[PDB]
Amino acid sequence: KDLRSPICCILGHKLLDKIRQTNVGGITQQIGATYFPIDAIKAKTKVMAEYEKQTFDVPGLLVIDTPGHESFSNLRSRGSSLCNIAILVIDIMHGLEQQTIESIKLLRDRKAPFVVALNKIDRLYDWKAIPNNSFRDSFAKQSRAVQEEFQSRYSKIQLELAEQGLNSELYFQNKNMSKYVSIVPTSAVTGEGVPDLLWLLLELTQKRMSKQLMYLSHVEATILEVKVVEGFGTTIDVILSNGYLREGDRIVLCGMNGPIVTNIRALLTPQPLRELRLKSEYVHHKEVKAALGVKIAANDLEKAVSGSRLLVVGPEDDEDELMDDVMDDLTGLLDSVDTTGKGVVVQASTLGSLEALLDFLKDMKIPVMSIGLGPVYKRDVMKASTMLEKAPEYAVMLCFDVKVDKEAEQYAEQEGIKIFNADVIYHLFDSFTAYQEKLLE
């Protein structure tokens, strides 16, 4: 069979610094991701033969490495196209951070599958480490004492997980993955448990997600970043999870003001050699194939929507129809709102973030007049102005993980339009409630 390389991401507070380490093969830094060829994974999971059967039927594994929630930029309905499984990192020493708690809620709302990497086991007192060893092997070789510290901290964390509504189990004791998330103890410092983690990701993707890895005729590529690069203008960073992209390809994209159609001018990956980075930070490719994180340079990318997908226009294909098709997600979001009624104006970083926020605002019966994506401008604030006479209360903008232009802020202040901006939804809610209540007293 020709199976796709599965794609995963890490939700962490560096663990991936340890996984990406190789000792004198073929692990490559890509754009916004790191790719692990299957042979490298074999080498790194060699010690797992002691405990498990091994399966190597995929070309490799792609790890989305950016620091945010970029793996959830698209609609949840296309989630698996962007990321097959998440790794929720939890500190064994000081337990759950708040960021961890949010990540748990986000994962539940996205309905995304994940495992837990229970990191920092080295910090257990008198931990005697065996570099890059499997967990069970190093653990059996610890003192009874060390084994007991592990059990204590582990149980504390299981409690803290149960408090976020999660039941949890060590991965080799999970017989009910539908009920229990698997826990893999790791050390970013020593590398211990990393073989276990690789084996487990391989296992879950190849065994319980075989259909997701099945060969696909058509391209699957999702926009994660829209970034200016001097010499290229506005570029886009994408995850190509299926198919091929070629220099010169006619592509259509979802944009803030409608569909964009353009032609690929360059396909770019990072330049690994220091000396060559003096000449260019990138390697140009005539053609690339999944699974990879790649930067695309093309004209007219300025209004591109993060989380949107790419369609390649074939000689046979109708461009106008495809242009309509690409919009479907954003348009579906637009249909969820009544532009006529009284309501707030909403603006979000990505299709996924916009969807998560809209779902929330509907859950709270909070009406929304207008919808938007990306950085906030004065023209965007102006949308809420109409609200002021009809309702003082709804003349507000609810913004998620976006930037507000100074001009927009001054305009809002001078107009008495409230701008609430946060990177966690409940912050927005609390601010809005507070505002309404203030208006009441």
Swiss-Prot record:
Chain residue ranges for the region called G3: 65-68
Effect of residue 68 to A: Reduces GTP binding and impairs subunit joining and ribosome-dependent GTP hydrolysis
Binding-site residues for Na(+), renumbered to this chain: 26
Record's subcellular location: Cytoplasm
Binding residues for GTP: 26-28, 119-122, 188-189
Residues recorded as bearing Phosphoserine in the entry: 5
Top-level taxon of the source organism: Eukaryota
Location of the region described as G2 in the Swiss-Prot/TrEMBL record: 26-30
Disulfide bond sites: none
Binding locations of K(+): 26
Binding site for Mg(2+): 28
Entry's family note: Belongs to the TRAFAC class translation factor GTPase superfamily. Classic translation factor GTPase family. IF-2 subfamily.
Stated role: Plays a role in translation initiation. Translational GTPase that catalyzes the joining of the 40S and 60S subunits to form the 80S initiation complex with the initiator methionine-tRNA in the P-site base paired to the start codon. GTP binding and hydrolysis induces conformational changes in the enzyme that renders it active for productive interactions with the ribosome. The release of the enzyme after formation of the initiation complex is a prerequisite to form elongation-competent ribosomes. Stimulates 20S pre-rRNA cleavage to mature 18S rRNA by PIN-domain endonuclease NOB1.
UniProt protein name: Eukaryotic translation initiation factor 5B
Protein source organism: Saccharomyces cerevisiae (strain ATCC 204508 / S288c)
Protein's gene: FUN12
Full protein stretch here: 401 to 852 of 1002
